[PDB]
Design a protein around this ligand. Structure first.
Ligand SMILES: [Ca+2]
Ligand SMILES: [Ca+2]
Ligand SMILES: [Ca+2]
Lengths: 252, 252, 252
């Protein structure tokens, strides 16, 4: 030996570069919401950002199908799951002739965050279908006058599971069923995800103000619905090198 | 007496807490746009935020029905009120075969703001259907070169009416008809609503920059259309404890 | 002479006012995305702002028709260009029974920026249909782990063409074909456009923080599709006094 140490070192340097690039303030951080439906459908929403990733989904987008992702016949709503149905979710006994539970009302959600993220700072907020701040312990939803928009429970970091890519943790995932227990049965959501900083300089303000504000909405939001998780993982998540926990609790 | 002063005081403390919580920077502020249609339909858009609530509605969302709120048959546009119709609004005599005035073109709007808000700072901007800055006094719409994006008239605070919840003012409401007089006949809107601060520390910047920027889009926007105001008030506004002025000028 | 110098001077002062008003931090800056389709259709998206204009378009809005701009029959998708089609764009050979290239997949884009803009600071980012950061030189799309969200090539200022209104430059335009050469064949985009400042005070932060953040989303986004460029120019661009480069390279 050692006749190919230069090629080796070069590959080593390349690997180091890709793996550590995540900590760059100009790399991507990713927030993915995977909605799960009792017919096997999964609807993906994926946000990208550099310093801060924020967003939300109201019922119109929590449900399937919708104006963003029509079903295979170009329909954005289903019979029995249209306006009257939504009205019955907004207010108990406030609807009319519709299905009790929509086929297109998700039963669960996976929330995935990937990147060099300030994990502890992550906020995931649950609201009812009417935009009311939701509370655990059979407390129901809070009005606008009593509703705490930033609660201790929004910090979900400790409930999230570490997801590895090779030998390092790449991201964290949270799985929750919509059962009125640990989450609303017909929720809407808001979220905030923050860049982990390798220094003390505030890149959300000062000389960085103009780009910090712009970056909030200057990255397209990917979204689609897939016939099932298997297809979503092979055709989206894997090629993106987004980590994802499958139905069996495996990181894929 | 006084054998239940502890229960009394406790209820008193609870009431004080809910009523004053509104001034907390972590409470909710609410901005509601209620669009009114000549068929009795009201379309509600409700934004929530902590420090700053901003948003806008273009014609696609000013009209009914739309991709956000389809009619009872899953339709997002009506015959005679589709693309050619919109084209006739954008430019005088620029359309073709459509109704002169859409059933789904709103005739009026109520703008409601609720919370501990910096009332004087509120901005409501009117634009034409083509995004032109609209002007009063038969001046018409301004081009991009002459258009003032922040005008004295955007400060509508003095035209808004105080809306009480019990013995305190909870919010303010502005009612305007779309008649080319005090508002465009086919308007689009933009708005900015600001947290009233109980101190001098700028919570929109400095150490608060990261959360101030995130909070702009991290709360879901509620939206629906109701068959009439009566149903909207009993099934949405009242349970939310959002104040609202009805068709008779009454606070409900 | 000179019996009408007062009228002359007055017109002169008026002209000076309109022409220089663009440099006011309270004037408008405009960002227009014109998508071009092989059937002659052009779809316009026009953003307005004061200090910073940012936005993006995912495939749902890059394509025609969509939920924002339905075709003449109220349809938001076409046969053979619906969900399965989108799936074939997201992943090579990941779709099924659909047209190879949608009639509604744009073949080119004009990107126009107008106002007193910090021209050099302009960012236009290209992504693939799956939200992957796109690269030139047959390099393909980058994963989330390797993707550089702020690249040297996003600064397109030097590739843009000056567009005059009278004797001054009013804006700049960039024309690009979606051919996998200088742009993705099925792109999605994100952009950031910045106010040119006539002073050193940072109006994106400090005492200007609250309004800087709000202004990001407080101006409605105009959007429509026109049967062809000729109609779009006479009925939208010209009356708005937005400069625009036509199919012949002429400023109109
Ligand atoms: Ca308990
Ligand atoms: Ca007058
Ligand atoms: Ca080369």
């Amino acid at each position: 030996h050692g006749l190919d140490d230069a090629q080796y070192l070069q590959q080593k340097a390349h690997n180091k570069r890709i793996s550590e690039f995540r900590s760059s303030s100009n790399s991507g951080i990713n927030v993915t919401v995977v909605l799960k439906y009792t017919n096997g459908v999964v609807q993906v929403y994926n946000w990208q950002g550099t310093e801060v990733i924020a967003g939300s989904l109201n019922r119109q987008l929590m449900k399937f199908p919708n104006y963003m992702n029509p079903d295979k016949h170009g329909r954005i709503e289903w019979p029995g799951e249209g306006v009257e149905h939504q009205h019955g979710l907004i207010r108990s006994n406030g609807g009319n002739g519709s299905y009790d539970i929509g086929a297109g009302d998700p039963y669960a959600m996976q929330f995935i965050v990937q990147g060099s993220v300030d994990w502890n700072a992550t906020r995931l907020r649950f609201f009812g279908p009417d935009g009311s701040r939701w509370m655990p312990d059979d407390q129901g939803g809070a009005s606008v006058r009593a509703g705490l928009l930033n609660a201790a429970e929004d910090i979900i970091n400790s409930k999230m599971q570490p997801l590895y890519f090779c030998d390092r943790m790449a991201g964290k995932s949270y799985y929750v069923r919509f059962d009125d227990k640990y989450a609303p049965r017909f929720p809407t959501i808001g979220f905030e995800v923050y860049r982990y900083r390798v220094g003390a300089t505030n890149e959300m303000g000062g000389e960085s103000a103009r780009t910090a504000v712009a970056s909030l909405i200057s990255f397209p939001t990917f979204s689609t619905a897939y016939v099932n998780e298997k297809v979503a993982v092979e055709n989206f998540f894997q090629p993106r090198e987004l980590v994802y926990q499958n139905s069996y609790g495996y990181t894929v």
